[PDB]
PDB file of C-alpha atoms and ligand atoms in Angstrom:
ATOM      1  CA  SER A   2       0.316   0.022   0.261  1.00  0.00           C
ATOM      2  CA  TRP A   3       2.259   2.290   1.015  1.00  0.00           C
ATOM      3  CA  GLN A   4       4.933   1.694  -1.708  1.00  0.00           C
ATOM      4  CA  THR A   5       2.215   2.190  -4.171  1.00  0.00           C
ATOM      5  CA  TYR A   6       0.729   5.221  -2.809  1.00  0.00           C
ATOM      6  CA  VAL A   7       4.333   6.246  -2.454  1.00  0.00           C
ATOM      7  CA  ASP A   8       5.902   4.290  -6.328  1.00  0.00           C
ATOM      8  CA  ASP A   9       2.411   5.339  -8.073  1.00  0.00           C
ATOM      9  CA  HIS A  10       1.831   8.899  -6.969  1.00  0.00           C
ATOM     10  CA  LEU A  11       4.544  10.018  -5.269  1.00  0.00           C
ATOM     11  CA  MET A  12       7.514   9.015  -8.337  1.00  0.00           C
ATOM     12  CA  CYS A  13       5.089   9.491 -11.641  1.00  0.00           C
ATOM     13  CA  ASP A  14       5.529  10.783 -15.541  1.00  0.00           C
ATOM     14  CA  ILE A  15       4.634  13.869 -15.282  1.00  0.00           C
ATOM     15  CA  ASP A  16       5.490  15.596 -18.643  1.00  0.00           C
ATOM     16  CA  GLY A  17       8.087  14.011 -19.471  1.00  0.00           C
ATOM     17  CA  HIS A  18      11.093  12.708 -16.208  1.00  0.00           C
ATOM     18  CA  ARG A  19       9.825  10.744 -12.817  1.00  0.00           C
ATOM     19  CA  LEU A  20      10.911  12.329  -9.978  1.00  0.00           C
ATOM     20  CA  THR A  21      14.424  10.725  -7.527  1.00  0.00           C
ATOM     21  CA  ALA A  22      12.724   9.607  -4.298  1.00  0.00           C
ATOM     22  CA  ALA A  23      10.030  10.183  -2.877  1.00  0.00           C
ATOM     23  CA  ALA A  24       9.361   8.981   0.845  1.00  0.00           C
ATOM     24  CA  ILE A  25       6.574   8.885   3.287  1.00  0.00           C
ATOM     25  CA  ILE A  26       7.500   9.545   7.127  1.00  0.00           C
ATOM     26  CA  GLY A  27       5.626   9.533  10.808  1.00  0.00           C
ATOM     27  CA  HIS A  28       5.808  12.324  12.912  1.00  0.00           C
ATOM     28  CA  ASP A  29       8.218   9.720  13.885  1.00  0.00           C
ATOM     29  CA  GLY A  30      10.543   8.840  11.886  1.00  0.00           C
ATOM     30  CA  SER A  31       9.434   5.734  11.465  1.00  0.00           C
ATOM     31  CA  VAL A  32       9.747   5.317   7.882  1.00  0.00           C
ATOM     32  CA  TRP A  33       6.580   4.077   6.213  1.00  0.00           C
ATOM     33  CA  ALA A  34       7.674   3.627   2.944  1.00  0.00           C
ATOM     34  CA  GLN A  35      10.431   5.116   0.008  1.00  0.00           C
ATOM     35  CA  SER A  36      11.511   4.975  -2.346  1.00  0.00           C
ATOM     36  CA  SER A  37      15.027   2.742  -3.535  1.00  0.00           C
ATOM     37  CA  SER A  38      17.091   5.257  -3.735  1.00  0.00           C
ATOM     38  CA  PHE A  39      16.106   7.496  -0.877  1.00  0.00           C
ATOM     39  CA  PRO A  40      18.713   8.989   1.907  1.00  0.00           C
ATOM     40  CA  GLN A  41      19.179   7.583   5.148  1.00  0.00           C
ATOM     41  CA  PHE A  42      17.801  10.918   6.664  1.00  0.00           C
ATOM     42  CA  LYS A  43      18.262  10.826  10.664  1.00  0.00           C
ATOM     43  CA  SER A  44      15.584  11.056  13.734  1.00  0.00           C
ATOM     44  CA  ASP A  45      16.472  15.072  14.265  1.00  0.00           C
ATOM     45  CA  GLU A  46      16.666  16.030  10.309  1.00  0.00           C
ATOM     46  CA  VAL A  47      13.338  15.285  10.701  1.00  0.00           C
ATOM     47  CA  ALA A  48      12.872  16.926  14.539  1.00  0.00           C
ATOM     48  CA  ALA A  49      14.201  20.170  12.970  1.00  0.00           C
ATOM     49  CA  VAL A  50      10.922  19.264  10.011  1.00  0.00           C
ATOM     50  CA  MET A  51       8.525  19.279  13.051  1.00  0.00           C
ATOM     51  CA  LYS A  52      10.109  21.958  14.515  1.00  0.00           C
ATOM     52  CA  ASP A  53       9.833  24.624  12.236  1.00  0.00           C
ATOM     53  CA  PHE A  54       6.143  22.913  11.510  1.00  0.00           C
ATOM     54  CA  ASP A  55       5.113  24.332  14.281  1.00  0.00           C
ATOM     55  CA  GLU A  56       6.852  27.794  14.447  1.00  0.00           C
ATOM     56  CA  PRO A  57       8.256  28.829  11.010  1.00  0.00           C
ATOM     57  CA  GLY A  58      11.364  29.745  10.785  1.00  0.00           C
ATOM     58  CA  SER A  59      13.859  27.943  12.631  1.00  0.00           C
ATOM     59  CA  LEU A  60      14.279  25.660  10.738  1.00  0.00           C
ATOM     60  CA  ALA A  61      15.073  28.249   7.908  1.00  0.00           C
ATOM     61  CA  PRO A  62      17.953  29.582   9.223  1.00  0.00           C
ATOM     62  CA  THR A  63      20.634  26.667   9.495  1.00  0.00           C
ATOM     63  CA  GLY A  64      18.629  25.140   6.625  1.00  0.00           C
ATOM     64  CA  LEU A  65      17.498  21.294   6.400  1.00  0.00           C
ATOM     65  CA  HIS A  66      19.932  19.182   6.055  1.00  0.00           C
ATOM     66  CA  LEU A  67      18.659  15.122   5.559  1.00  0.00           C
ATOM     67  CA  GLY A  68      19.038  12.625   3.823  1.00  0.00           C
ATOM     68  CA  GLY A  69      22.499  14.096   4.160  1.00  0.00           C
ATOM     69  CA  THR A  70      22.766  17.332   1.653  1.00  0.00           C
ATOM     70  CA  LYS A  71      21.716  20.730   2.755  1.00  0.00           C
ATOM     71  CA  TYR A  72      18.565  22.605   1.999  1.00  0.00           C
ATOM     72  CA  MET A  73      17.372  26.599   0.755  1.00  0.00           C
ATOM     73  CA  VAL A  74      14.147  26.968   2.528  1.00  0.00           C
ATOM     74  CA  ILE A  75      12.403  28.835   0.126  1.00  0.00           C
ATOM     75  CA  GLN A  76       8.389  28.961   0.910  1.00  0.00           C
ATOM     76  CA  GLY A  77       5.376  26.979   2.436  1.00  0.00           C
ATOM     77  CA  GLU A  78       2.332  26.864   4.361  1.00  0.00           C
ATOM     78  CA  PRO A  79       3.505  27.930   8.590  1.00  0.00           C
ATOM     79  CA  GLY A  80       2.520  24.768   9.950  1.00  0.00           C
ATOM     80  CA  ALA A  81       1.886  22.326   6.880  1.00  0.00           C
ATOM     81  CA  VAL A  82       4.117  23.405   4.189  1.00  0.00           C
ATOM     82  CA  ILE A  83       8.139  23.081   3.688  1.00  0.00           C
ATOM     83  CA  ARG A  84      10.270  23.389   0.111  1.00  0.00           C
ATOM     84  CA  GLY A  85      14.223  23.546  -0.145  1.00  0.00           C
ATOM     85  CA  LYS A  86      16.258  23.623  -2.736  1.00  0.00           C
ATOM     86  CA  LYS A  87      19.899  22.510  -3.984  1.00  0.00           C
ATOM     87  CA  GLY A  88      20.582  24.629  -6.681  1.00  0.00           C
ATOM     88  CA  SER A  89      18.947  22.367  -9.306  1.00  0.00           C
ATOM     89  CA  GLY A  90      17.574  20.444  -7.198  1.00  0.00           C
ATOM     90  CA  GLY A  91      15.621  20.127  -4.377  1.00  0.00           C
ATOM     91  CA  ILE A  92      13.139  18.930  -2.075  1.00  0.00           C
ATOM     92  CA  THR A  93       9.852  19.883  -0.702  1.00  0.00           C
ATOM     93  CA  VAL A  94       8.138  18.536   2.910  1.00  0.00           C
ATOM     94  CA  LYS A  95       4.033  17.903   2.848  1.00  0.00           C
ATOM     95  CA  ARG A  96       3.203  17.831   6.268  1.00  0.00           C
ATOM     96  CA  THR A  97      -0.035  15.514   7.386  1.00  0.00           C
ATOM     97  CA  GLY A  98      -2.174  14.434  10.433  1.00  0.00           C
ATOM     98  CA  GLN A  99       0.427  11.697  11.344  1.00  0.00           C
ATOM     99  CA  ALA A 100       3.078  11.381   8.345  1.00  0.00           C
ATOM    100  CA  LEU A 101       5.249  13.713   5.893  1.00  0.00           C
ATOM    101  CA  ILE A 102       5.242  13.222   2.239  1.00  0.00           C
ATOM    102  CA  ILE A 103       9.024  14.457   0.712  1.00  0.00           C
ATOM    103  CA  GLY A 104       9.822  14.658  -2.251  1.00  0.00           C
ATOM    104  CA  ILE A 105      13.331  14.856  -4.177  1.00  0.00           C
ATOM    105  CA  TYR A 106      14.191  16.384  -7.572  1.00  0.00           C
ATOM    106  CA  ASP A 107      17.098  17.309  -9.585  1.00  0.00           C
ATOM    107  CA  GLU A 108      17.013  18.800 -12.754  1.00  0.00           C
ATOM    108  CA  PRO A 109      14.828  18.808 -15.576  1.00  0.00           C
ATOM    109  CA  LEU A 110      11.656  18.081 -13.217  1.00  0.00           C
ATOM    110  CA  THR A 111      10.999  22.062 -12.347  1.00  0.00           C
ATOM    111  CA  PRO A 112      10.550  22.439  -8.150  1.00  0.00           C
ATOM    112  CA  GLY A 113       6.524  23.517  -9.524  1.00  0.00           C
ATOM    113  CA  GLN A 114       6.664  19.441 -11.205  1.00  0.00           C
ATOM    114  CA  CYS A 115       7.760  17.855  -7.896  1.00  0.00           C
ATOM    115  CA  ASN A 116       4.306  20.346  -6.099  1.00  0.00           C
ATOM    116  CA  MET A 117       2.599  19.240  -7.692  1.00  0.00           C
ATOM    117  CA  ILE A 118       3.076  15.539  -6.871  1.00  0.00           C
ATOM    118  CA  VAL A 119       4.336  15.568  -2.991  1.00  0.00           C
ATOM    119  CA  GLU A 120       1.072  18.051  -2.052  1.00  0.00           C
ATOM    120  CA  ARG A 121      -0.535  16.371  -4.147  1.00  0.00           C
ATOM    121  CA  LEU A 122      -0.829  12.977  -2.130  1.00  0.00           C
ATOM    122  CA  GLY A 123      -0.025  15.413   1.375  1.00  0.00           C
ATOM    123  CA  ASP A 124      -4.352  16.773   0.323  1.00  0.00           C
ATOM    124  CA  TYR A 125      -5.146  12.991   0.330  1.00  0.00           C
ATOM    125  CA  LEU A 126      -4.197  11.380   3.556  1.00  0.00           C
ATOM    126  CA  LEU A 127      -5.542  14.891   5.351  1.00  0.00           C
ATOM    127  CA  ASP A 128      -8.286  13.971   4.311  1.00  0.00           C
ATOM    128  CA  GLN A 129      -8.958  10.419   4.885  1.00  0.00           C
ATOM    129  CA  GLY A 130      -8.203  11.078   8.443  1.00  0.00           C
ATOM    130  CA  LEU A 131      -4.342  10.984   8.483  1.00  0.00           C
TER     131      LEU A 131
HETATM  132 NA1  LIG B 201      -2.627  19.393  -5.150  1.00  0.00          NA
END
């Protein structure tokens, strides 16, 4: 299930190019499911994420390092979304009521495109019980 909710949604052929590494995680790090090529985040990298969600910004200063790489926060619904970017590619963290969707991308996949996707599911699960 999670591995379809990810490999059939979180990693589709928009326009003509898949994403890079999707992953759905709990508000605690518990890795519900994730792409084969998703990066070993860190229970903390995650805790920070949660930190900013309650109080926007706080992450942004130091940036978001996770899956190893650091990202430059950008713009997102304070308490609901968070976007990060590193050159061509970047990341997005859709926060559900119990989980957090996540997408990683690199050229030629526009940040826009990523959004569309991570944010897509997020809507769903939210209004479905999570
Ligand atoms: Na949407």
